[PDB]
Amino acid sequence: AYGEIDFEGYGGQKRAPYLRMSHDTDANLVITLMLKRWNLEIPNLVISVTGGAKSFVLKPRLREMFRRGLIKAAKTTGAWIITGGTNTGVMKHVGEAVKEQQLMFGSDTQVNVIGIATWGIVDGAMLDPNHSHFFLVDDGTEGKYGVEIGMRSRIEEAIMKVIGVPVVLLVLEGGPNTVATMYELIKKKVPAVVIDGSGRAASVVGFAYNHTIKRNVDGQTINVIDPQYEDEVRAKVVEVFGAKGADKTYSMIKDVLEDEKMISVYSLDGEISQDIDLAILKALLKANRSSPVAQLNLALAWNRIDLAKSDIFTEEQQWTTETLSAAMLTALLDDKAEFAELFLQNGLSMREFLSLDILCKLYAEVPGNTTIKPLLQKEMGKRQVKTIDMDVVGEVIEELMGDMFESYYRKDGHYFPLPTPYLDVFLWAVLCNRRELARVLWEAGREPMAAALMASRLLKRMASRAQEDNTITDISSDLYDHARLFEERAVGVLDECFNENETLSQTLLVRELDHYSRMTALELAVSAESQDFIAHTSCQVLLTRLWMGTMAMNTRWWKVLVCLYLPVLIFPIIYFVPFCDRIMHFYSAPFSKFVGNVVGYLAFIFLYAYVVLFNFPRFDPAKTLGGIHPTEIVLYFWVFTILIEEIRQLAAKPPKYIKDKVSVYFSDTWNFVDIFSLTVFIIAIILRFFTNSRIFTASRIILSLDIIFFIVRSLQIFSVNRLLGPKLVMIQKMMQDLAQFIIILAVFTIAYGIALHAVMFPSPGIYARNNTWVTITSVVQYPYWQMYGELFLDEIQGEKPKEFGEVDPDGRWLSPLLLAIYMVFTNILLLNLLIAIFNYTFERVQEDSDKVWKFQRYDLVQEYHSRPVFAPPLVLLGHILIFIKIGLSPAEMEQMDNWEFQAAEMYIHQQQQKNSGTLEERVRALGDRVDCINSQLNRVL
Numbered sequence: 001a002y003g004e005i006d007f008e009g010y011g012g013q014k015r016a017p018y019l020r021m022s023h024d025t026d027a028n029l030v031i032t033l034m035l036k037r038w039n040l041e042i043p044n045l046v047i048s049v050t051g052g053a054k055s056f057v058l059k060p061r062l063r064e065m066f067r068r069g070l071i072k073a074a075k076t077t078g079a080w081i082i083t084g085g086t087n088t089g090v091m092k093h094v095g096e097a098v099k100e101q102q103l104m105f106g107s108d109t110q111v112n113v114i115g116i117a118t119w120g121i122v123d124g125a126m127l128d129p130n131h132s133h134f135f136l137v138d139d140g141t142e143g144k145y146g147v148e149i150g151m152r153s154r155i156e157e158a159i160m161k162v163i164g165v166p167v168v169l170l171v172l173e174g175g176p177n178t179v180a181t182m183y184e185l186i187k188k189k190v191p192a193v194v195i196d197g198s199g200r201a202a203s204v205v206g207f208a209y210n211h212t213i214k215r216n217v218d219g220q221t222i223n224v225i226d227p228q229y230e231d232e233v234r235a236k237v238v239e240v241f242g243a244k245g246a247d248k249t250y251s252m253i254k255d256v257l258e259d260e261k262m263i264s265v266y267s268l269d270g271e272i273s274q275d276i277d278l279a280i281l282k283a284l285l286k287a288n289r290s291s292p293v294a295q296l297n298l299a300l301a302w303n304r305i306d307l308a309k310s311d312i313f314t315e316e317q318q319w320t321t322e323t324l325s326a327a328m329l330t331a332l333l334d335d336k337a338e339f340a341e342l343f344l345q346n347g348l349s350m351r352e353f354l355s356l357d358i359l360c361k362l363y364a365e366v367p368g369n370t371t372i373k374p375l376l377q378k379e380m381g382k383r384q385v386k387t388i389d390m391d392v393v394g395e396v397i398e399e400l401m402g403d404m405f406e407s408y409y410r411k412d413g414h415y416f417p418l419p420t421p422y423l424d425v426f427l428w429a430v431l432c433n434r435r436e437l438a439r440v441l442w443e444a445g446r447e448p449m450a451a452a453l454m455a456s457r458l459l460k461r462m463a464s465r466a467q468e469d470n471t472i473t474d475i476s477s478d479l480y481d482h483a484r485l486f487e488e489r490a491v492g493v494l495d496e497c498f499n500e501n502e503t504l505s506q507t508l509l510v511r512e513l514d515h516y517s518r519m520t521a522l523e524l525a526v527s528a529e530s531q532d533f534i535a536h537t538s539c540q541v542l543l544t545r546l547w548m549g550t551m552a553m554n555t556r557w558w559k560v561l562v563c564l565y566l567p568v569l570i571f572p573i574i575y576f577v578p579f580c581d582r583i584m585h586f587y588s589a590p591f592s593k594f595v596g597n598v599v600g601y602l603a604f605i606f607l608y609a610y611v612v613l614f615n616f617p618r619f620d621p622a623k624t625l626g627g628i629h630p631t632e633i634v635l636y637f638w639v640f641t642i643l644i645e646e647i648r649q650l651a652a653k654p655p656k657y658i659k660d661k662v663s664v665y666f667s668d669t670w671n672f673v674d675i676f677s678l679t680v681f682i683i684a685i686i687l688r689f690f691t692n693s694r695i696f697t698a699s700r701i702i703l704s705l706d707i708i709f710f711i712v713r714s715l716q717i718f719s720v721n722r723l724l725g726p727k728l729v730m731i732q733k734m735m736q737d738l739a740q741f742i743i744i745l746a747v748f749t750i751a752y753g754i755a756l757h758a759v760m761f762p763s764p765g766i767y768a769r770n771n772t773w774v775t776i777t778s779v780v781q782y783p784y785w786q787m788y789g790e791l792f793l794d795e796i797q798g799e800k801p802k803e804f805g806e807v808d809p810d811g812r813w814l815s816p817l818l819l820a821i822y823m824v825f826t827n828i829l830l831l832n833l834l835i836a837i838f839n840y841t842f843e844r845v846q847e848d849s850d851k852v853w854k855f856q857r858y859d860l861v862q863e864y865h866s867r868p869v870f871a872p873p874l875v876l877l878g879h880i881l882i883f884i885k886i887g888l889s890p891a892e893m894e895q896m897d898n899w900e901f902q903a904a905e906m907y908i909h910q911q912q913q914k915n916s917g918t919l920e921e922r923v924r925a926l927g928d929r930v931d932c933i934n935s936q937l938n939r940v941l
């Protein structure tokens with residue numbers, strides 16, 4: 001009789017196979033049956049739980065601690081649990097522990113709970129319906145119990161033969177057959193863990209283990225009972241469990257304790273909050289029979305880093321890449337960053353470990369609560385490929401870096417050993433939003449501040465992506481915190497690089513970073529909008545040397561101006577940091593180009609203002625030159641110069657394709673202001689010539705309103721000043737706030753204006769404004785000007801009937817009431833709310849204004865570094881004369897990488913010294929010292 005029980009509605013769809021057996025059966029047949037016929041996976045652990053069956057008395061805090069610890073030890077490992085097939089005792093509570101942790105839980109949570117029972121008691125006692133497999137071993141009549149014992153010992157012997165699998169024994173609250181199975185498993189060299197202080201037979205063993213420890217023999221130095229307490233343990237074994245025939249179980253409970261490495265005692269009141277899995281791990285590392293990798297992946301499954309450093313990673317047992325590779329895969333995939341660090345620092349290298357298939361697998365088993373799984377799955381949806389590879393990962397990284405980034409998985413043939421294994425496992429750890437794993441993989445790999453700036457860009461752009469998308473879980477606060485963490489890591493590396501040899505810091509911030517799509521550390525810092533990095537002293541003296549191009553870093557603007565239009569007075573009073581060489585080095589400076597742009601642009605604004613304010617006549621073919629004044633021709637020349645300047649800025653973008661040049665060109669809004677003002681000027685000067693009244697009227701109005709947009713373009717000039725620049729950043733963010741609040745202002749303005757114009761001017765009547773346009777513009781207009789305190793009191797109360805209108809007489813008293821309500825709601829309440837929003841914006845910018853000026857100083861340097869090295873009024877002639885990021889040696893790049901890595905090492909060491917020097921870590925280490933003093937005093941006493 002062999003088959004599969006379907007328990008009648010006792011919890012669980014999955015049925016449980018059973019097998020009638022005998023004790024004559026060798027256990028190799030049983031293990032090949034339960035590994036081939038029943039298809040159980042070979043476990044990393046076999047727990048054998050043993051205790052009482054009928055007379056089972058259990059404590060509630062002990063039963064909850066035991067079942068929580070045993071489920072935590074079995075599910076995190078994937079362990080077999082071997083008990084009896086009995087619906088009562090410790091078997092019932094192990095079965096209920098397995099039952100209550102799987103119903104409405106994860107799908108791949110199935111603990112194979114094997115019940116080895118006797119066929120002579122099933123329907124003695126009923127089989128437990130929460131067990132998974134059943135071994136029903138018998139040889140004779142009913143009531144027999146000893147046929148379970150030997151077969152249960154031999155099956156676990158054969159599990160250790162396939163030692164291979166670390167079988168452990170838990171003993172708690174048992175009786176005579178509990179210590180019988182316990183002794184037969186000790187004979188099979190199964191390490192036992194006894195729960196002392198729990199019950200009637202697991203206390204006695206505890207009361208015979210540490211209370212009566214003694215070594216008084218040769219022959220591997222066994223442990224025996226004390227002669228002082230032999231009377232007490234004999235009274236306890238004859239009274240507590242067992243009435244008659246307790247001599248054989250007393251001899252048995254003595255011969256259990258013969259070997260010190262196979263018995264271990266873990267009580268409840270001794271170590272309360274400590275889980276039973278470390279007790280199992282100490283028993284397995286104490287028996288000294290398991291593989292190093294079996295002990296290793298049990299410590300991985302139980303997150304036991306301290307015992308792994310203590311006894312698994314001893315100096316006498318060395319490690320290799322292939323003997324740590326599966327453990328490293330488990331530590332990476334399950335977010336075990338201290339195990340990952342330990343594996344990297346003992347015997348493992350990412351160059352030998354990480355391959356292409358391991359990395360694609362590493363991006364395959366991302367958990368799902370991260371942003372990177374919806375990003376990769378959306379790229380698979382755009383790709384129509386069922387599997388993951390590095391082309392998908394590289395394209396996710398390209399759209400998640402932005403700014404024409406080119407990921408090296410798309411390019412390099414190794415991604416279709418690896419070139420940079422630390423970098424791409426680091427980028428994996430960053431994309432998975434893993435704090436300590438990305439910290440460990442950042443500390444381990446080269447090019448550290450570029451890696452940290454790229455990580456900050458990835459994390460805050462995933463933060464923007466998860467904030468802007470509803471199909472991605474908003475973990476944006478954790479992502480911005482992680483990005484800020486990598487920002488301060490990059491700043492600290494740059495600070496340690498700047499503390500010695502600032503010249504190497506400047507030559508390190510402008511390098512050829514080939515694994516970052518050939519962009520520098522400054523460009524990785526300004527793409528990531530890392531303001532604390534750009535505000536560092538190294539980046540600012542770099543921007544000041546770039547801003548003063550081969551010219552002394554403190555020459556004032558007036559010397560540049562008087563030597564800018566006088567190239568003969570340039571020789572005495574401009575000093576250089578080392579015919580025409582001094583000329584081209586002076587005009588090459590972006591500060592010279594800046595001062596020339598300021599002066600020529602003030603000249604342009606004055607000429608534009610003379611044209612729009614004083615002389616912009618109509619076009620007529622009667623007089624010469626169409627009547628166009630030659631100041632307007634000089635204005636056409638200089639706006640054509642602005643046009644050719646913006647065409648040169650478009651053509652001089654680092655991409656090669658035209659659409660990518662347009663994408664890089666319209667990244668800043670100043671190019672939007674440029675293209676808008678140029679297009680509106682070209683429309684105005686096309687409409688200039690059509691000699692119609694309305695067309696020329698539109699031409700001059702469009703021109704006289706486009707001077708506003710040229711002056712709006714002139715504010716990047718003001719961004720040169722430390723005071724004025726952040727004020728313009730404030731103006732920009734306040735215009736964003738005003739664009740957000742203008743809908744609420746428009747709703748209350750139009751709501752008041754409709755009622756106001758309805759009560760003043762009722763439309764089917766004699767007080768009606770018989771013009772739809774003056775009605776609509778009154779509804780828009782009069783609340784808006786009344787909002788600024790321009791009360792139309794004499795107008796809206798019926799007086800001034802000429803220029804306002806005949807107000808309805810019943811609307812002459814209701815109009816001040818509506819006006820008063822609108823004034824207290826809009827001038828007082830809404831406008832001061834808008835000013836409060838403006839002040840909140842002011843405080844947010846002013847608390848960071850120094851760093852935001854340092855950041856926009858980069859864009860100021862970039863917009864003048866590319867300008868033509870020519871005259872400030874003749875810069876179109878400079879474009880005519882044109883039309884007609886450093887690279888180091890490979891030895892220099894290697895030395896610069898070594899220097900950057902060593903300064904990162906000093907930074908990481910200083911962070912460890914700050915971490916170990918805090919009050920909490922000092923108190924923690926002092927408590928560990930007090931625990932060592934207590935252990936030493938226990939060894940003395």
Ligand SMILES: Nc1ncnc2c1ncn2[C@@H]1O[C@H](COP(=O)(O)OP(=O)(O)OC[C@H]2O[C@@H](O)[C@H](O)[C@@H]2O)[C@@H](O)[C@H]1OP(=O)(O)O
Nearest residue numbers: 050051052053054055084086124125174175176177178181
């Ligand atoms: N495996 C069993 N399943 C169900 N009942 C058992 C079992 N073994 C004995 N008993 C009974 O319970 C009474 C006392 O129960 P305990 O002493 O607490 O059970 P014990 O600790 O000796 O053995 C339990 C078995 O379950 C596992 O802990 C381990 O494999 C071990 O062989 C006995 O007079 C015996 O008397 P009775 O069958 O109820 O007339």
Ligand SMILES: *[C@@H]1O[C@H](CO)[C@@H](O[C@@H]2O[C@H](CO)[C@@H](O)[C@H](O)[C@H]2NC(C)=O)[C@H](O)[C@H]1NC(C)=O
Nearest residue numbers: 761762763764765766767768769770771805806
């Ligand atoms: C707007 O048009 C209406 C419609 O004709 C004018 O209402 C008339 O006004 C005259 C005297 O003002 C009355 O004798 C008529 O009886 C009115 N007709 C209706 C249908 O009410 C109104 O005067 C016009 N208002 C303006 C400002 O032009």
Ligand SMILES: [Ca+2]
Nearest residue numbers: 649670671674
């Ligand atoms: Ca521009």
